[PDB]
Amino acid sequence: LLSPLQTARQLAAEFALTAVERDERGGTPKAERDALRDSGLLALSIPTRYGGLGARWSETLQVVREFAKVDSSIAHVFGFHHLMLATVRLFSRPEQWQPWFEQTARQNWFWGNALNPLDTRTVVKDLGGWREFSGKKSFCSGASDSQMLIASAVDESNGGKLLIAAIPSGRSGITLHNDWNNIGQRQTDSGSATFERVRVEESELLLDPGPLSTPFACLRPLIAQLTFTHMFLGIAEGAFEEARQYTLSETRVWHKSSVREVREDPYVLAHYGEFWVALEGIRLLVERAAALLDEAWAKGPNLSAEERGHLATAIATAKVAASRQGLEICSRLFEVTGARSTHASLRLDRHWRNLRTQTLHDPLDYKLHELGDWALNQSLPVPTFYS
Amino acid sequence: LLSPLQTARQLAAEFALTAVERDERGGTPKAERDALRDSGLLALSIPTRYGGLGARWSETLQVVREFAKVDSSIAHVFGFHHLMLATVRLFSRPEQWQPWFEQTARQNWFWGNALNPLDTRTVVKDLGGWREFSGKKSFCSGASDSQMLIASAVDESNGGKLLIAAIPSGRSGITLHNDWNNIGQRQTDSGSATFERVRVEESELLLDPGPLSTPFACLRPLIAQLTFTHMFLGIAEGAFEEARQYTLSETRVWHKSSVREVREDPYVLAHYGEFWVALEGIRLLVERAAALLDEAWAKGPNLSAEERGHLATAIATAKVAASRQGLEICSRLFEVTGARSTHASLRLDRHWRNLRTQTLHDPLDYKLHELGDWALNQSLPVPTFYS
Amino acid sequence: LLSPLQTARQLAAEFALTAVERDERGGTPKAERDALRDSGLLALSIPTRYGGLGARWSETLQVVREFAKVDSSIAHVFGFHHLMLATVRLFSRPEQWQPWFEQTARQNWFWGNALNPLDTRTVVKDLGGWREFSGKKSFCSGASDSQMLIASAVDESNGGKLLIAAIPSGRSGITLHNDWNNIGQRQTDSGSATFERVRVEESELLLDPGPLSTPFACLRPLIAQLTFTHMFLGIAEGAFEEARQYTLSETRVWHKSSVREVREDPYVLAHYGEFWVALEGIRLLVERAAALLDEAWAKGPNLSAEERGHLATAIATAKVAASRQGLEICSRLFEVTGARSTHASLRLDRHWRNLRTQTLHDPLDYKLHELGDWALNQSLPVPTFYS
Amino acid sequence: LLSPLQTARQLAAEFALTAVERDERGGTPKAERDALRDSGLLALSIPTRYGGLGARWSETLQVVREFAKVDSSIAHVFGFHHLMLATVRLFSRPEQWQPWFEQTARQNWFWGNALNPLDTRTVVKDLGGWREFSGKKSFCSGASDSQMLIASAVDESNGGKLLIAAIPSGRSGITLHNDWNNIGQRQTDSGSATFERVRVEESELLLDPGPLSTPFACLRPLIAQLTFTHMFLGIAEGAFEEARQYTLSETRVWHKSSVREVREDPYVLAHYGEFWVALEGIRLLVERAAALLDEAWAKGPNLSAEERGHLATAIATAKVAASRQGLEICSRLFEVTGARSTHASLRLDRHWRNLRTQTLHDPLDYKLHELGDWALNQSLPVPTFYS
């Protein structure tokens, strides 16, 4: 009876009731993850012909953004779940990903991340009949309480080629440490894992066409980048709305102010006008990138490298704006909420901390470098796991 | 048979050949205004049933933006000509503006500005069957070399009531001074005017419904605001493109740089990335406001105050971004063009000077106040001649 | 025999060993406060004739800054202790403050804050030979584990008159709640207090000359402002130094960088150059204000309103720079320390959180208003408890 | 009867009367240069034992700053005159520079610049008995109407070594084109020169100890950098004062303002407070660098490389602040002077144009790179002609 957005907004309201306490507690948000299981939204990105809801990417990412207004850790593991599904869809054969889609939709499997291209400590050995992953990995966003994992390993042949597999999260030999302890994103379980001779079947390797191959396959890093981008916008929007409520409900006018109510103070209003101009610009850039992703995805394997590159530029443009202007809102909102809004029971700084943490994993200065290469030299970005 | 955009682009390419020397001379760009007369573009906004081209406002404003890339003074008088046509369309009866539209399209009349709501030095006396305007006016953008003028006067009853008329620019008693000397917009003829017992017939007064009446008539200041906004964007786009050509052609690498070519300098590329993110955000905000103007214009007299207010907010948001981020591009581009690009024969500072002058006639701080009133309090802007 | 600066540096090195874990715990830093008692530094500002060290204000504030590099909560309660001593020195008769000074230096009394001019929930009744304070107070910075308190109350005559007293912290009727829970300054004990018929002798009231009387007595809010300002600078300096160590020890180069070492990355170096320019400007502004405070203090009761006003302007100028540029360093340092520096065991965000909390108790926008009144109109600031 | 500063301020008042008209005219300010000749200030930096006034560098640069408030072109050629005297003082033998100092003080010789290390088009040939400079040069600041020139040439031996000479400006073979045509600094005569077999005696070569030799000799580029820096501060201070006068005299309050007078408008006052904080920070950084230059100069040939390096860092820090914050004041002052202040008769943009032009000859991004190398790595700057 409800649309996916309506279902997400209802869930977000329930999440908001415990979000502040859970930011302090950290750990696995098991009750919230089960609420996602029961909602149906783990099948949001899966087409209806496999039992899913058939949303376009722009709708899936809209739900990521909606969760991020209240709970960016939940938004992160939810968005990464659909990124893992995109990974098998783009990197493997229909005989592999179609059953995975059907089982995920039927059983509400939660997919977690164990793919770190910049962590070559996990290696794969070939034992003829099967292969085995062995080593350690970090930044395993949402591996705990998951049913399936996307795991990477290096095959030390001619310098070391990355190999990606989809495997059950409880398979023998996998030890998920859940030592994730960070100032932000405190419920994404982005801790460590140990792989001890973990068996991987040929049928579980994502090889055809595999990573960084066709332009369509090369949408995978762009989906990841735009997932983060929607999170960034959601965090800024949630911070803004929380500040609004506080300004109107609790903030007292400064005794030197010319007005009697905070909501008429000329400096307070100018701050809110600057927040508005920033948010409006981010919103249009993010939504334009999402529409371009919809259009690129619809071309499938016929996607051109040119169209992929223009999408990549549009996403990076949105990400820079969401990162920089978003973090500024999360800091400067304290000037309109005031000295009492720093009470630890409110944890109003959680928006800033979450966004500060997540904007560092892909350095902004090198995003500007890439965008300048387009703006000055008309050079398309080179497809990587970050671009 | 070229489209209006193609026609405007061809003219802009010709204007570009002399724009630098004309920035120096100032005065009236009579040759360029005659090129506009010959082009048909003075009828761009006039519906086809009166002999015009039938463009939507977004298309008319796109031409303003295109002209502003190469010559913001021409962009200004061209945009203001269409604003004058909008003024008679919105404030007077069809018995008045339909003949004016037909004559303008048939004879390529150029319409000029003599409407300043601030300056109240012009007063209107009633002589029975006719009236007379007498006084001084400033900022008469495009009055020189025009066929028709929109002129305002104050009637001295009940503290003053503003009266607006459309009258031929050469009518007895009108003196245009051509004493316009400004650091920017140096070919807009925005000088001074003197009216001495200028006869004004009742059929020339714009009374039904007159200014600041219906939401539809209250589109007039919004068209003005969005005309300036398209000019601001065009100036920044033209400055950006001129900087690109200089960086790639003339600028030398700094002897402390690690790279052989300025094309690859990490700081140069980062600047161009920041210019790109700024321009892309402005572009989407301006084009969104343009689309909302098309949709509101289509409502005609059925337009609601609520839709007018949301359009107003969208335009002001775009105007703030275009003003602030546009001026920043026009200043900071010198860091990527280098010490030789300040040669007086290039007049590369003309973009900054033009934007610096035009961003002052409506103070940004009070636009942010208005936007904060919306963002914080959900208060729609109050219709005025600037909002 | 060490100098006070050397003694403070030694203590700061010891405080640094546990500052991160104490930021987590919160509560009262009893061990560190006892280390202050043993150090002699609680008598730093007390003249030698009373058994103190005889420091100038610039020297006392230098120690506040030194502590703030490693532990801004300790810096806060230490600076506020000396502010309390300044309060009795400036507002009461030598018959009152000379014994308090002698006893403080002999017994290493820690003085705490219970003076909030905003909060008027505490009232004083006159019972003839004595008075009684009853009510609630908030923001009681350093009241816990103190020997003496500076407490204010309102007398309900002629719309309210503020009364200030110095009283022992354990006097019957005083309850300190230790309910202080804030995102920053987590060991300043700035919780709540309750007074119930707290007896106050006439000899404990600070009436002659009392607050906001002579220009010399009006140094009290300026000492408070410059104490915060030295804390703001110290926080930014400590954050900068902690970032340096991380950049050089732990941060890895981005795989798109041209350089092998983060030490040589052009964007990293540019960030550190911008941090340097900011810190150097703040440092000179703060030290100039400190020198002007020494010179004004030396005038004693002969201080003129004009010299007080110029000092006020100098302090506010330093405070704006330290607040704004300091918070920027504390945020932007994460771009040069990288994605691994957000580990919760490092609490590298503690500098930003501490500065973000403390910069709100006196709104920056109205400090800029005051400074513009000087810069434009040559109007001296009006003495208040914040200016 | 007047001190040099008083004499300069009196001259500055006379210069201010024609400054706006001369910014338009360009060319050589011959009347103003003769006024400098008659003032005695061309001997300001020459010790009294040679007939000069014996000012310290901080006083000479204070006069540069004072001229720059009203006329940055005059400030530039005046400052470069004393830089040329410093060049012979630091690079040549007492038997060379002592007579040059005596003759300059006795005859008020004006020294001009023809030294461009980045213009290797002028070469020197050795004819045994004498040498000859031949080729072209650009950026010859103030060579016109000068008595002496500092000229450079490359000796094409082992790659090309730079050779510096002091020679009469009217010597046979020198053709000063005076084609200087720039958007700012329009009266510095920084045009071109042609050298046609210009004879140079051994006694005119600056060889012992020559350029970039001892730390003391290496003060020459630092004097140049700090001369520009004092100019930058002076320009910002003059722009600020001119804006003040306009705000208080001519600016009208915006019709949406809450106040009746511009000087009480809260946004206007906040702008002026930001100008104040910026100017105060620049002032202290510039004055601190000037004091350090005084102290370094006084050490003479005993100056250590360490003390030179710390001076270089202090100057670069001041220059970055003066450049960036100065240019921001020159742009943002238009928001408090308003729409009528762009009148071309006022040329209020001349401050921005002058500072925009002069901040480009040493790129700010690479200054930040150098300062970061100090801040992060504690690496002293490497002496060059720009550092």
Side-chain angles (χ1 to χ4, degrees), chain D residues 119-126 131-137 152-156 160 162-163 195-198 200:
Chain D
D119 188 338
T120 60
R121 287 180 298 165
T122 297
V123 309
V124 39
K125 302 295 180 54
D126 192 354
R131 305 169 199 236
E132 284 178 9
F133 291 8
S134 295
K136 295 181 177 300
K137 289 196 122 303
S152 55
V154 292
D155 160 47
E156 317 190 50
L162 190 63
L163 175 68
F195 284 76
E196 192 72 65
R197 293 192 64 244
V198 176
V200 180

Side-chain angles (χ1 to χ4, degrees), chain D residues 229-255 257-306:
Chain D
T229 298
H230 278 74
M231 289 168 51
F232 297 173
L233 169 59
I235 291 165
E237 289 182 314
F240 169 88
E241 184 52 34
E242 187 165 19
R244 267 194 83 246
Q245 295 299 324
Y246 198 95
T247 296
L248 298 174
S249 303
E250 304 287 336
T251 303
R252 308 172 182 173
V253 89
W254 179 241
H255 74 75
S257 178
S258 61
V259 302
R260 47 263 132 87
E261 272 198 315
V262 184
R263 76 231 281 151
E264 290 170 344
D265 180 283
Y267 298 130
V268 172
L269 289 170
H271 280 301
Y272 272 97
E274 292 184 327
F275 300 156
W276 182 254
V277 175
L279 284 174
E280 285 290 89
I282 300 164
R283 284 164 177 156
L284 296 188
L285 287 168
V286 172
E287 288 169 357
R288 176 192 57 187
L292 292 172
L293 171 55
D294 284 353
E295 294 167 2
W297 183 268
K299 301 210 177 47
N302 295 332
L303 182 65
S304 69
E306 183 179 43

Side-chain angles (χ1 to χ4, degrees), chain A residues 258-333:
Chain A
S258 61
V259 302
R260 47 263 132 87
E261 272 198 315
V262 184
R263 76 231 281 151
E264 290 170 344
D265 180 283
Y267 298 130
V268 172
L269 289 170
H271 280 301
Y272 272 97
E274 292 184 327
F275 300 156
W276 182 254
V277 175
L279 284 174
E280 285 290 89
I282 300 164
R283 284 164 177 156
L284 296 188
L285 287 168
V286 172
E287 288 169 357
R288 176 192 57 187
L292 292 172
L293 171 55
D294 284 353
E295 294 167 2
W297 183 268
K299 301 210 177 47
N302 295 332
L303 182 65
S304 69
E306 183 179 43
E307 183 172 342
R308 191 269 185 195
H310 285 80
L311 175 59
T313 298
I315 290 163
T317 296
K319 194 170 172 232
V320 172
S323 292
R324 288 188 146 177
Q325 293 181 277
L327 193 70
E328 173 65 12
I329 294 171
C330 294
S331 174
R332 223 208 311 155
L333 69 84

Side-chain angles (χ1 to χ4, degrees), chain A residues 181-182 265 271 342 344 365-366, chain C residues 181-182 265 271 342 344 365-366:
Chain A
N181 200 26
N182 197 285
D265 180 283
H271 280 301
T342 56
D365 287 317
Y366 281 100
Chain C
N181 202 28
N182 194 280
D265 183 282
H271 282 296
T342 56
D365 285 317
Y366 283 102

Side-chain angles (χ1 to χ4, degrees), chain B residues 181-183 254 257 265 267 271 327 331 334-335 339 342-344 349 352-353 356 360-361 363 365-366 369, chain D residues 181-183 254 257 265 267 271 331 334-335 338-339 342-344 349 352-353 356-357 360-361 363 365-366 369:
Chain B
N181 202 28
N182 194 280
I183 68 173
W254 180 242
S257 179
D265 183 282
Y267 299 131
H271 282 296
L327 200 69
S331 171
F334 283 91
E335 285 195 43
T342 56
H343 197 292
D349 66 324
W352 186 90
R353 281 189 281 103
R356 173 73 289 177
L360 297 175
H361 288 80
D365 285 317
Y366 283 102
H369 181 109
Chain D
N181 200 26
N182 197 285
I183 62 148
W254 179 241
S257 178
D265 180 283
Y267 298 130
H271 280 301
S331 174
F334 284 92
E335 292 197 34
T342 56
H343 198 308
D349 65 317
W352 186 91
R353 285 188 279 106
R356 175 72 287 178
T357 303
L360 297 174
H361 291 268
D365 287 317
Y366 281 100
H369 187 286

Side-chain angles (χ1 to χ4, degrees), chain C residues 133-153:
Chain C
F133 288 18
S134 293
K136 294 162 292 186
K137 303 203 112 295
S138 56
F139 288 120
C140 291
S141 305
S144 303
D145 185 49
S146 69
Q147 280 62 62
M148 294 290 294
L149 285 179
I150 303 292
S152 62

